[PDB]
């Protein structure tokens, strides 16, 4: 991600391939998770479900 700041940034799926076709019907819990560094595990800053 870049800059961020107080203003919200149009991010995530702009022209990406994150679209997933589900199989079972029901309630699914999608989970965004932010990390400081790009190494496993790193530091999880926040996680909105």
């Amino acid at each position: 991600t870049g800059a961020l700041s107080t203003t919200p940034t149009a991010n995530l799926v702009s022209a990406g391939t994150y679209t997933v076709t589900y199989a079972s019907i029901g309630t699914k819990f999608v989970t965004l998770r932010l990390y400081d560094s790009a190494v496993a595990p790193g530091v999880l800053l926040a996680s909105k479900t």
Binding site: P8, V30, L32, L34, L45, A46, K48
Partner: peptide, 7 residues
């Protein structure tokens, strides 16, 4: 440290 998110 503080991060507001939406989804």
């Amino acid at each position: 440290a503080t991060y507001t998110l939406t989804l």
